[PDB]
Design an enzyme around this catalytic site. Structure first.
Site, short mmCIF file in Angstrom:
data_model
loop_
_atom_site.label_atom_id
_atom_site.label_comp_id
_atom_site.label_asym_id
_atom_site.label_seq_id
_atom_site.Cartn_x
_atom_site.Cartn_y
_atom_site.Cartn_z
N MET C 378 0.83 -1.19 0.00
CA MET C 378 0.00 0.00 0.00
C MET C 378 0.87 1.25 0.00
O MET C 378 1.84 1.34 0.76
CB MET C 378 -0.94 0.00 1.21
CG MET C 378 -1.87 1.18 1.25
SD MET C 378 -2.80 1.47 -0.26
CE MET C 378 -3.71 -0.06 -0.41
N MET C 406 -0.42 -1.33 5.35
CA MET C 406 0.90 -1.43 4.76
C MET C 406 1.64 -2.62 5.36
O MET C 406 1.37 -3.04 6.49
CB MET C 406 1.70 -0.14 4.97
CG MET C 406 2.02 0.17 6.41
SD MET C 406 2.59 1.87 6.68
CE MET C 406 4.18 1.84 5.86
N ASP C 431 9.27 1.73 0.83
CA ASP C 431 10.24 1.61 1.91
C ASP C 431 9.56 1.63 3.27
O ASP C 431 10.01 0.94 4.20
CB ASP C 431 11.29 2.72 1.82
CG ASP C 431 10.70 4.06 1.46
OD1 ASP C 431 9.51 4.29 1.78
OD2 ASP C 431 11.41 4.89 0.86
N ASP C 458 11.69 6.12 -1.75
CA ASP C 458 11.66 7.57 -1.76
C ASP C 458 12.03 8.16 -0.40
O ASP C 458 12.06 9.39 -0.26
CB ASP C 458 10.27 8.09 -2.16
CG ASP C 458 9.27 8.01 -1.03
OD1 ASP C 458 9.24 6.98 -0.33
OD2 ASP C 458 8.52 8.99 -0.83
N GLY C 460 10.38 8.15 2.49
CA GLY C 460 9.27 8.88 3.08
C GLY C 460 7.97 8.11 2.90
O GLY C 460 7.93 7.07 2.24
C1 LIG Z 1 -0.46 0.33 9.04
C2 LIG Z 1 -0.60 1.68 8.35
N1 LIG Z 1 -0.23 2.75 9.03
C3 LIG Z 1 -0.34 3.95 8.50
C4 LIG Z 1 -0.87 4.06 7.19
C5 LIG Z 1 -1.22 2.94 6.52
N2 LIG Z 1 -1.09 1.75 7.13
N3 LIG Z 1 -1.77 3.06 5.12
C6 LIG Z 1 -1.26 4.18 4.32
C7 LIG Z 1 -2.57 4.79 3.71
C8 LIG Z 1 -2.92 3.98 2.46
O1 LIG Z 1 -3.60 4.51 4.62
C9 LIG Z 1 -2.65 6.31 3.42
C10 LIG Z 1 -3.41 6.65 2.14
O2 LIG Z 1 -1.37 6.86 3.38
C11 LIG Z 1 -3.51 7.01 4.47
O3 LIG Z 1 -3.03 7.34 5.58
O4 LIG Z 1 -4.71 7.28 4.20
S1 LIG Z 1 -0.13 3.66 3.14
C12 LIG Z 1 1.15 4.46 3.41
C13 LIG Z 1 2.51 3.91 3.04
C14 LIG Z 1 3.34 4.96 2.30
O5 LIG Z 1 4.68 4.77 2.64
P1 LIG Z 1 5.56 3.72 1.73
O6 LIG Z 1 7.04 3.99 1.80
O7 LIG Z 1 5.39 2.30 2.22
O8 LIG Z 1 5.02 3.87 0.20
P2 LIG Z 1 5.44 5.13 -0.75
O9 LIG Z 1 4.17 5.89 -1.02
O10 LIG Z 1 6.03 4.64 -2.06
O11 LIG Z 1 6.48 5.94 -0.01
C15 LIG Z 1 0.99 5.36 4.64
C16 LIG Z 1 2.15 5.43 5.63
N4 LIG Z 1 -0.35 5.13 5.28
C17 LIG Z 1 -1.00 5.36 6.52
MG LIG Z 2 8.25 5.45 0.68
#
Ligand SMILES: Cc1ncc2c(n1)N[C@]1([C@@](C)(O)[C@](C)(O)C(=O)O)S[C@H](CCOP(=O)(O)OP(=O)(O)O)[C@H](C)N1C2
Ligand SMILES: [Mg+2]
Ligand SMILES: Cc1ncc2c(n1)N[C@]1([C@@](C)(O)[C@](C)(O)C(=O)O)S[C@H](CCOP(=O)(O)OP(=O)(O)O)[C@H](C)N1C2
Ligand SMILES: Cc1ncc2c(n1)N[C@]1([C@@](C)(O)[C@](C)(O)C(=O)O)S[C@H](CCOP(=O)(O)OP(=O)(O)O)[C@H](C)N1C2
Ligand SMILES: [Mg+2]
Ligand SMILES: [Mg+2]
Ligand SMILES: [Mg+2]
Ligand SMILES: [Mg+2]
Ligand SMILES: [Mg+2]
Ligand SMILES: [Mg+2]
Ligand SMILES: [Mg+2]
Ligand SMILES: [Mg+2]
EC number: 2.2.1.6
Lengths: 554, 554, 538
Positions: C378, C406, C431, C458, C460
């Site tokens: 995700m 995630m 990441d 990235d 972040g």
């Molecule tokens: C367990 C949990 N904890 C917190 C969140 C989560 N899951 N899901 C997301 C989500 C999809 O929920 C949303 C859209 O960012 C949000 O907050 O609404 S995913 C998302 C991951 C982005 O980081 P990552 O490095 O992995 O991917 P890149 O985009 O390429 O950098 C972020 C941290 N989120 C909140």
């Molecule tokens: Mg990232």
């Protein structure tokens, strides 16, 4: 056009009050009356019902609104409706909702609640009703968004009426029903168009019927629904397999329309159905759930077990069906009937068991005072004909009536009571009479159960309900006392004082009677039946012989 | 020797039945009687009580067992006990337990339950009572280990009686109370030896009292407990600060023992206490919780707020105390009294407000029929003297009595009803009489509230309770009707039929009366008081003037 | 048969064998080590994981592919509470999962049942040793039957250690009634803009053949929720209108609002809010294994409950003629064709560093063929892949994620590989999501799982950052430091790859695919163009 079109006889309105949409939704559900007691938080729904064809029926205790609603639900198949205010108005329903849920009676209770803004604190009714009703309902929810108002009410009736029916509770915050809402009524959807169990499975059961030599049908709640009446009869005629019913299915098959009916099971340990079950090599349960009759008391495990119901079985120790037919019951029984190659030839013991049942089926030769129970049962038999409904409360009298339930020829009998709640008979009778006010209803209770709901005699008079209530008077809680005597040889908390139940009834404006002698019972009941309105008859009973009958129980 | 020694007057026994240990634990708690209705699952506790000094009092509806228990709890400070069977026996208690918890009345309910082995299924009483009672109790638990039997009962009384008192529920599986147990009784521990709020804080409040010119005390539930009586009086005499009380503290201070009592607050919007609160520059709350009187209705926020209670405040929008004195109330008030340098000099408005209150404090010059409420209040005043207890149900009559509560000189008044439950008066009176059976108790209700608990008239006769019950008869749910009239100018669900309440009472074996004329009221009440037992008096009332009184409410 | 079991754990294990359980994921502990012990005497394989949450993820993948519940086995206390997120994700996506969690002795009684109830189909504690096999059997029945979901069973220590008396319980609907299928067939004929809306159950393997036969005889256009993202694709049905629920420029949404007849198959309103597609101006038909979960914008006029496969077959038999597309319908599908062309380029990735997302997607497409499984974590990358799902020709794609958890990709891939260990599995995450489950790289090495994991790096939480930029024009809490994922992967004993140049990703991914075991590839990405893609969302 479509079910959810924004232009139809169910138009999307700007409703001045959420209560107006609630009432329109009730009309769509076919609700004919509402039972309950008004209050400030919910008085707008009561008010909106004035502009409706739905009839407002005030009761004197909310619990009896749930009882009346359950009777309406059982007879019509559509949920009876209770309407109460917040706080103690809701909590007074809980026992009734549990009794309805246990028996499978569709009931929707609409309970008021404080304003949404006042839920985040401790006010006059900061009562978490959803948490309290959840354990005793199929469905309990609070309307927090005014847009979902009609949705929540519709889903409550859907939960109550569909599948295995049950009770449903809806909490309505005051500001939601008073304030404006934008929405439309949701037209009622009937039962799903379900398919029969798979053919490979019904043929498998059909092959078991042939291979079987002591098969028996065990009918449960759903077997007594009208949708399955024709299919059930057609299956019994082509198969001639004996039948036995739980008390939730006490009406699905009567002895006078099927020769191989083995009585009702669940209460007595000396029933033809019980012997046929333990004798059986194949048991086919139709519309049955283990809750209706603990499988530990009839399933010896030495027989193949088939489950036919609208829902999958909830497997357990003494209920692990070997074959599972899930689908539309009527469609399943029809397909099963098509694969019956021949009618059953009863085994000697099976045939003998049914003979012994009919040979059994005293009496009036008992002028003793107080009246012997078996005499009261005979006098009740003479007045309860096919045009009368019989409601039975809970107590020792309940066991006597159940013992001789084959001999009552009533149009309908409300006796099934898994929760064993006392006080159900009279409010059950008022609800049943409201469905068919042209007929007579006879309710029977003890003195204990009577006073827990006798307040509704005022409701009966105000309704002019043609209800005859019989009280077996012993000045105590006998059904409990007998248990204490057998276990401890002494009584504790089962005795109370006498009452003048004749004058008691008369104080409500109803006709009162008191059987002073054993010869006066039939004359009195005869006169009380001829009353065109509420009547009460006090019947002094002699329970000395109860230990003999109770030894025949499980 | 020690509290948990294995060798003492509380010996570690091998009990034949868990019920025996339960009963011994009740004796250690000082329980004098038990209210309820027996059943199979719980009949062993009823049986064991036969060998005990504890008195078994059967009621006719479990809900009233909870009401009677609450009255016992409020008067004695130790929990009243209800004893019911499983299933509907327990669910019939829920409204009563909520009413007790809301008012702070210590109540322990012991409810039967199915065998532990049968909880993992759907049997006659597979009812999750703990989940149902949790939202309306301080404490709800089921005994699953027979070793913890006495512990759970002891903790139930501890939860109910200590801190801010409340209701507690204990579920007792049948096999636990029937089977043997190995354990000992747990001797009852009194209140904690709590210390007063810190000196740096009490001096801070003492400095505010001096700097203040319109201080006022707001008394809550805990201020009315006997442990704080002497300390509270000593603080009022040395400070001469005016006082106003919630209805949970309606008895902590009477107008006849303190000249600067400003009445009770929580119900009317034209009270001396309300004016003094909104006028106040310093409000000191003693034993008070926001639930007793919504701070949004009296805390204008323009005054320093001090919180004195056994527990920390639950801060909220309109209740953010600037100073918080947490500890033993009596010890806090004593230390606070030591730092009062001088008595308060009332301000002109403050003094004028108290003058206006006393100047107010018609009547009997009202021979109209039906009787005008103000006339009924006068006739009640003449019979309710300092030797009589007064219990008040819920309805329009409740508002009238509350409006003139300064004029009643009763030993104790049970009127506080946050949940606004109807049907409380009569069972409250029976419980109160059992504590002091040498005194007279007067209960007053409407016709609606009367029939929800009138079943207990049989209990009163069986107990020979010296209770006089007054019914304000209007053949409707007036308190609800008035709200509908003001809001919608039409009535819905608030009218029912008449009854012969005289003959009704007589059918129970009690003395019945009916006020036929306005001149017959005083003669009738006089005669009914002189009855040495249960008596009922029907009083036709004319509520035409109710809209005038209800406009004085919040 | 009834047997005298020395330890309740023995009955539990025999019941699992009867269920067809091939492996168990989890972490042992004192309260539950007897079930671990009993599994030694069983054909069932014990797979220790490094964090319980990932046992639920691996179990869900097994459940989705096989249709029989994957099994997690944890101890009491934090062993159970570490499962909750995984069990919630499984329940939301409809993956059958049974979690067996230890508990303290009954005499000594964390209320795990109360904690798991809101995120499971079924949660219960075994308090009577007699009901042990009953509860386990009912847990598998709850998880696998109807609309599948997750189920939790709490096993007190004394129950599984002490003796029990019981028997193993050995491990089905009919098609909708004929009168009801004739009713629906008549509605299709009278209809002029019909469309199928496929839900979770339409993607089950039992309904694949029946669904294809229904689409061939009717030629009605199709659109799918993301829980049914694999039931139909663009390359096997010409009138596929894409998946709906995520993008605001999909043919499926336009066809639904245009439709005069909508036939939902295996669909529940939870998969895609009906308020966004059901305008109410069309007859609505519900075909599913369960009655409809009715709400405001979902009141079907016809309700077919029963065996989907048997229902669709019978319905296909009663289709008299193939659909003639309306101009708008044809234009909508034409626009989707042109949209797919516009979604394609071809472009020579002028911005080689950081690697442009569209470049990474193409490189993934070249290695993910019909024999490869793709699991998607995700993040912003998730949106990119979802944008180009039509272009992936994968054997199976695990991307649906309503809870948006995630860290799912890698454990999903390990579970999926275990079902068909002869095939390659490709997992892709960010990441952020990577480090929430990267502990299972040791499990992958220990299992020799043929899993290729791709990290869009990235440094972040980009998917959150883009949301903050649009809303506040500034970032808060979405930046962290860099990592050398090559040495990180290599420290686990797996092959590590670092995309050092824009020309090396395909050479690297090609080399990483050729690895016969665990491999990780860090792919620096340039999310500068994310606002362009994210504007296409709802
Ligand atoms: C367990 C949990 N904890 C917190 C969140 C989560 N899951 N899901 C997301 C989500 C999809 O929920 C949303 C859209 O960012 C949000 O907050 O609404 S995913 C998302 C991951 C982005 O980081 P990552 O490095 O992995 O991917 P890149 O985009 O390429 O950098 C972020 C941290 N989120 C909140
Ligand atoms: Mg990232
Ligand atoms: C369990 C329960 N169920 C329902 C309500 C209740 N208790 N309490 C009241 C209340 C106080 O709650 C309020 C103000 O009427 C309301 O609805 O808000 S009292 C009242 C009692 C009937 O009236 P009664 O004949 O006894 O008295 P009169 O006013 O003199 O006629 C009414 C029906 N209520 C709702
Ligand atoms: C709400 C509720 N509270 C408590 C119990 C109850 N309902 N139901 C019964 C039950 C059936 O539950 C059982 C068998 O007595 C029992 O305790 O198990 S009935 C019974 C009703 C009183 O007896 P009654 O005078 O009416 O009848 P007779 O037997 O003829 O004297 C009794 C007190 N029960 C417990
Ligand atoms: Mg009307
Ligand atoms: Mg429920
Ligand atoms: Mg009796
Ligand atoms: Mg005693
Ligand atoms: Mg609580
Ligand atoms: Mg009244
Ligand atoms: Mg699948
Ligand atoms: Mg759940």
């Amino acid at each position: 056009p479509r079910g959810s079109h924004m232009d139809k006889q169910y138009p999307v309105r700007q409703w001045a009050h959420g209560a107006d949409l609630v009432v329109s939704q009730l009309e769509a559900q076919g609700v004919r009356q509402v039972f309950g007691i008004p209050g400030a938080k919910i008085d707008k729904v009561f008010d909106s019902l004035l502009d409706s064809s739905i009839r407002i029926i005030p009761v004197r205790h909310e619990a009896n609104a749930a009882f009346m609603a359950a009777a309406v639900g059982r007879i019509t198949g559509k949920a009876g409706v209770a309407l109460v205010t917040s706080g103690p108005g809701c909590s007074n329903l809980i026992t009734g909702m549990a009794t309805a849920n246990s028996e499978g009676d569709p009931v929707v209770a609409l309970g008021g609640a404080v304003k949404r803004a006042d839920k985040a604190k401790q006010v006059h009714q900061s009562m978490d009703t959803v948490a309290m009703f959840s354990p005793v309902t199929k469905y309990a929810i609070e309307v927090t968004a005014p847009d979902a108002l009609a949705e929540v009410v519709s889903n409550a009736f859907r939960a109550a009426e569909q599948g295995r029916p049950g009770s449903a509770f809806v909490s309505l915050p005051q500001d939601v029903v008073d304030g404006p809402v934008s929405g439309k009524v949701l037209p009622a959807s009937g039962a799903p168009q379900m398919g029969a169990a798979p053919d490979d499975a019904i043929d498998q059961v059909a092959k078991l019927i042939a291979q079987a030599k002591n098969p028996i049908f065990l009918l449960g709640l759903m077997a007594s629904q009208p949708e399955n009446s024709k299919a059930l009869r057609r299956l019994l005629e082509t198969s001639h397999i004996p039948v036995t019913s739980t008390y939730q299915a006490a009406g699905a098959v009567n002895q006078d329309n099927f020769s191989r009916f083995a009585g009702r099971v669940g209460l007595f340990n000396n029933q033809a159905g019980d012997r046929l079950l333990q004798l059986a090599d194949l048991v086919i349960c139709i519309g049955y759930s283990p809750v209706e009759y603990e499988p530990a008391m009839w399933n010896s495990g030495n027989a193949t077990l088939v489950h036919i119901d609208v829902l999958p079985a909830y497997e357990e120790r003494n209920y692990t069906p070997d074959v599972e037919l899930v689908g539309d019951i009527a469609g399943t029984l029809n397909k099963l009937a098509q694969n019956i190659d021949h009618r059953l030839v009863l085994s000697p013991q099976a045939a003998e068991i049914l003979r012994d049942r009919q040979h059994q089926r005293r009496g009036a030769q008992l002028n003793q005072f107080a009246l012997h129970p078996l005499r009261i049962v005979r006098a009740m038999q003479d007045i309860v004909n096919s045009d009368v409904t019989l409601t039975v409360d809970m107590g020792s009298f309940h066991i006597w009536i159940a013992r001789y339930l084959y001999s009552f020829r009533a149009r309908q009998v409300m006796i099934s009571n898994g929760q064993q709640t006392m006080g159900v008979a009279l409010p059950w009778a008022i609800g049943a009479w409201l469905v068919n006010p042209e007929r007579k209803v006879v309710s029977v209770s003890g003195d204990g159960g009577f006073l827990q709901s006798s307040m509704e005699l005022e409701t009966a008079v105000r309704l002019k309900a043609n209800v005859l209530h019989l009280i077996w008077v012993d000045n105590g809680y006998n059904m409990v006392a007998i248990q204490e005597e057998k276990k401890y040889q002494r009584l504790s908390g089962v005795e109370f004082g006498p009452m003048d139940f004749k004058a008691y009834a008369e104080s409500f404006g109803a006709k009162g009677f008191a059987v002073e002698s054993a010869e006066a019972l039939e004359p009195t009941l005869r006169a009380a039946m001829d009353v065109d309105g509420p009547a009460v008859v006090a019947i002094p009973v002699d329970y000395r012989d109860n230990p003999l009958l109770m030894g025949q129980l499980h």
